[PDB]
Amino acid sequence: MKKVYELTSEEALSYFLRHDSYTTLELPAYINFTTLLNDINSSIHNKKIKIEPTAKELMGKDINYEVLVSKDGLYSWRRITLINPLYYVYFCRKITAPATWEIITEKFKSFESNDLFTCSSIPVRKWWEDFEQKSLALALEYEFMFSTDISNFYPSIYTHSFEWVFISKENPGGLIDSHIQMMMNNQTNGIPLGSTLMDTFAELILGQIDIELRKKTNELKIINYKVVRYRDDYRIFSNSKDDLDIISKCLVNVLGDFGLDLNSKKTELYEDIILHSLKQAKKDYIKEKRHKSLQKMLYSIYLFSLKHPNSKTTVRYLNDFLRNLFKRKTIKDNGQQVDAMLGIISSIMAKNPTTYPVGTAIFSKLLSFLYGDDTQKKLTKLEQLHKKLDKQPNTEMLDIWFQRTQAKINLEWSYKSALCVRINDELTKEKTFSVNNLWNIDWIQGKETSPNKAKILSLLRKTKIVDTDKFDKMDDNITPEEVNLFF
Amino acid sequence: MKKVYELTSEEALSYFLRHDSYTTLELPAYINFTTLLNDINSSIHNKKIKIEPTAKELMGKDINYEVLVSKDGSWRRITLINPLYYVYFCRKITAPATWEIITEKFKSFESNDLFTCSSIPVRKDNWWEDFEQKSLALALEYEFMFSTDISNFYPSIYTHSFEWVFISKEEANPGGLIDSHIQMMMNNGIPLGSTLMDTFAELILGQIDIELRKKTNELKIINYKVVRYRDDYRIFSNSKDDLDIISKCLVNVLGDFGLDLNSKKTELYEDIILHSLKQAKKDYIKEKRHKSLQKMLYSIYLFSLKHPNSKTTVRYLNDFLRNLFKRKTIKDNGQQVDAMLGIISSIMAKNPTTYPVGTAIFSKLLSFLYGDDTQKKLTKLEQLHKKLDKQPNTEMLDIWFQRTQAKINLESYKSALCVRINDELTKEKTFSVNNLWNIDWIQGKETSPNKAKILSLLRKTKIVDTDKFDKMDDNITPEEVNLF
Amino acid sequence: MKKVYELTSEEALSYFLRHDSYTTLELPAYINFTTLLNDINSSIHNKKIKIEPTAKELMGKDINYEVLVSKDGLYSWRRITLINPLYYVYFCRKITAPATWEIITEKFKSFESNDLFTCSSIPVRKDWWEDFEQKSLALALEYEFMFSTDISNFYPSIYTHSFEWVFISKENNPGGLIDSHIQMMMNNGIPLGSTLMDTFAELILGQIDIELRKKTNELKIINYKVVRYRDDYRIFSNSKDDLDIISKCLVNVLGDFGLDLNSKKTELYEDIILHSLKQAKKDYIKEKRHKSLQKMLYSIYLFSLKHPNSKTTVRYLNDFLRNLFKRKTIKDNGQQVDAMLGIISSIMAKNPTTYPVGTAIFSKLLSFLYGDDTQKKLTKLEQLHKKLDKQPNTEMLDIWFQRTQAKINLKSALCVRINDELTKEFSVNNLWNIDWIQGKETSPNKAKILSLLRKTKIVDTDKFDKMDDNITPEEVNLF
């Protein structure tokens, strides 16, 4: 498969306009932004519309749509950004321009010449992870390991560092620096998170830290080592404890120039490479007992959810429970056992927000057993489920996946989410779809009835972001196949 | 099925005169007290005998038979209530002049919507407990849980409190009927091991539910649910401040009944799913299924250390008996079988509740090795007796060795019940009732028409149903253990 | 089968001349010392060569070859001795003579009279739960408490002069012929490796048993039983006070032999079933069976860190080898295989006892990956040898690494002697010293002995090609 850099300019624009590359959220399948991005693209190419930004016009206006995922802790959240589709296609068309994309593709090819390092996180155009398989394999060659991570790589990048990538001291770097400035209030504070476009930018400076670390490396003559990397997750292998310490002090020096540093918690020099190549949550998943009883397995999942809270391994181990739900036929003692399993899975979600897709699928399929067709009694248990889970402060990701099950059981009866009310407009077949408080067009010059803004408003209000053809083909309950792609 | 309060007087006395109703001991299946208790009922019915006790006639006499079960470790005392006094005390309760107003008090417990009980006696017929499955389902509604027990509930029930579940003010009712007759058989406590004594506990526990509901409605605390099983309390609320105020009212209403809370088992939880199952139930789920017999039996032994004297070990041992009965041939009988006998002998040495299932696999393990050689098999069973005889109680052991030794040989006991069962098994004439139950309180000397016609009914009536004994297996079957 | 003392004089020599009896060291199947020693015997019986020892001539000369096994700890190693073949067949013929053999068998038979003491570690002619563990488990039916100990360093601390005290009292003795024949073959305790030493160790061990029962019958203590394996004691009784006076008597009789009990492994156990099995065996039952190859091999690595250099881990790598041999085609050789080669390489680089089985899974794994291309495989074996040569001693590595290397293509005196017999060239140089023989190499006596050592092959070429390319589970299950 082709990575982002060994493909052509026309292929890079077509790749960046995919709903996959636009935003990598745990979103239902019926949401698809490809047609909207590909319509506003060809409209700029056909000169039907014109996108022309200005730092003065853009300063002081919030542009994007931010969705909050709890990630971990439940007192902290991650700000995933839905970039304005108008500014996104324009910003994709500008870096995919052959004048600068030629420089970008060859800058990545220079990272491949850095032969000591291995970046397994470069985006690609579509067992165990390669980051782990590459670490277990090099134990045959090296005995020691240095694992580390970056505190907030995406939120702490000094945006002016992009200029330091292509040129040194004092170019596509200034182009990148200037346009993350146009969004996010011209603060140079951070870069957005939740897009392949933003990931491709991160790997440019990640590979540049890789370039500059090798430059300090060769000056001190330490060339018998290897590095396996995935985003900010660094793993340096060598057979000399003295070398790793020097490489660590050089890696903290190069990060000191880009305004970053190592996570003191997740930074350690290791002697058992095989032990520390896997996460502790993935190790305990191996030892979990295989159960045939549903309640025995589901209760075992909850206990696993305490030792490893808000972990994606809990979703994998919950997804396999959902695999066995569709395989079973009759659920004996539905009046007693099903009610008990509902309270179990409701508590797993009340403490682990990452399990909203699977947990809603668990709550949906178990209710198709207790109430076959009586959707009225089904809706009361979801409202009971929502009343509990809504006690958390930021529950927008719940409302989106709660809507997937809601839309297939009853469309006639207020989600309070700008995206969810937009989906509901396209689900209820409304005349014009809402765009207010979803994406701000105030940066575009003119009035709402101006020949340009009203023409762009026609695209935002008529283009469907929901594949109603796929939605009608989707099953009544959430299937494991819809969640299996989230890994 | 129907509850104990959903029965009329004609079938309430029928339920109370069942062997399961009379005692709840882990007695073998060839001792059914149904024929004795139902025939002495007819004697009072057709005026053959007269049974009317008096506080002065009965004060100072140990009327009932007592069997000690260690429970954990500290040993409980289950009471085999005197059959004469039992049927008199059940007929007076099932009298329609009082049974109509005892079940009426049970019906008022049903109107208490916030409280949910599952420990009411149920007229039975010929996985996951409801106490846990109900609490697991309540995590959808509530988030906090308050779980306590009543410390020594049965041994410390104030006897005069039975009058308080009907009328509050006391001066010079079914409460006095129960308060007066319980003090006659005992002399402060309540006997254990009978479902009649459980129905009395549910009335005083149900009144606690009613009185707590009156105290919680005056304080305007409405959003909570209670799941109760006898002593075990579980209160569910979404408010940590409401939950520890209902607690302060529970200790007040239990403080007026001479009761208290087990402070060692009193806790306010947050994970309802976590503390809905006991620790023994959780670790039982995690256990690896071993195909090897010695590997599994050794794993069961290690479980008994981390969970001393628990019914989960009996359930985990009963699965090993099901595996033994499935086997038809075992190999390496020399070193492997002898090592397994030593493993189970150590389990019973520290887990007294494993006496039935421990003797079960021991007799089944011996038949796999020594075969039909009754001499070598019986001598090894006596070697097991000598080891376990060091423990203080072991009265239940003699009850269950009697079931094992009788099916392979005949002729000890050293127990009034064991010698009586042995007399009924060997088919003698006069069954020994001399030291089993004290009938001295029956006014009149021997040979008199009342005591002699009662002695004729205590000696000639068979409590050991021999047709069932002749239909069982030589070794203890897993089905027998499953009934307990 | 029959024990070592239940064999007559003629077969006792045939037993001591067997390769699995000459050495218990885990060696490849193509090594067979049965041909060399048994042909040296027939040379002594035919008077073609006469081995005459002298305490003055043998003094100041290392007569034997030694191979180091790490055992455990990795900073400590145990010296396994391949006794000199000439001195071995001589010293084997000396005690197996009917005059001195009848006295030894009459002594081992006296150990049978000690009904309270049962030994399951006497050497026996060949053909789950070990008997030391199964017997200790069944005794829980009779007794309640247990007292398990181990002599601190039994073999290396035996006073060689104590072999007389097992046949005489204080001060022509049969045990005296052993005190002088061990102090001659080594610069003056008992060596390690040969079953001849196991029989000598069991002599005084049975005498510790006889002398202990004298002190316990004197103190009117009799209601107890003892299960023993070599120096591993397990004393059972129903009286904790009796057990402390039995142990206090065991340290006395052991102190009379200059022997010590390990303080670290000494405890009066309240629970027999709990401590009847080693901890590594108890955790082996707790391990979850895995259908995935990598999930199993990673679980093996985790087990080796809680029980380092354990023979229980060897059994559990052997299960992995049996599963590899069953699989016809491998699943995803590009990524999954290269990782498993690193897992086993890290296990062998910290658990030296896993050198044989580990080399086996290394080779079988490369056959699934690189296939029949031996050039691409040899570069990985060199990568494995480099990672493991960082260990200090190795040697045992090189022995089991020849078995894989020499089977596909052609450091120590032993591994080059095997190399000589695989090229049909046989230099006995620097392997067994012969300088304790009168005359030079030109003299007929020494020249005739060099001929028998050089002509007889210690490697059976008919078995080498008969063996498989990779080390099979049937080879590692013997050890």
Tab-separated table of N, CA and C in Angstrom, chain A residues 96 139 147 168 217 433:
chain	number	residue	atom	x	y	z
A	96	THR	N	-1.196	20.402	-1.394
A	96	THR	CA	-1.142	19.450	-2.495
A	96	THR	C	-0.832	20.121	-3.825
A	139	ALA	N	15.205	-7.850	19.932
A	139	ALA	CA	15.821	-8.408	21.130
A	139	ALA	C	16.900	-9.425	20.787
A	147	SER	N	12.478	3.522	26.512
A	147	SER	CA	11.136	3.899	26.096
A	147	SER	C	10.793	5.277	26.645
A	168	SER	N	16.790	25.752	7.669
A	168	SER	CA	17.409	25.840	8.981
A	168	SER	C	17.708	27.294	9.321
A	217	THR	N	23.876	12.509	17.126
A	217	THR	CA	24.399	11.156	17.272
A	217	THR	C	25.741	10.994	16.573
A	433	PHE	N	-30.895	21.649	5.610
A	433	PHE	CA	-30.141	21.199	6.769
A	433	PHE	C	-29.543	22.390	7.507
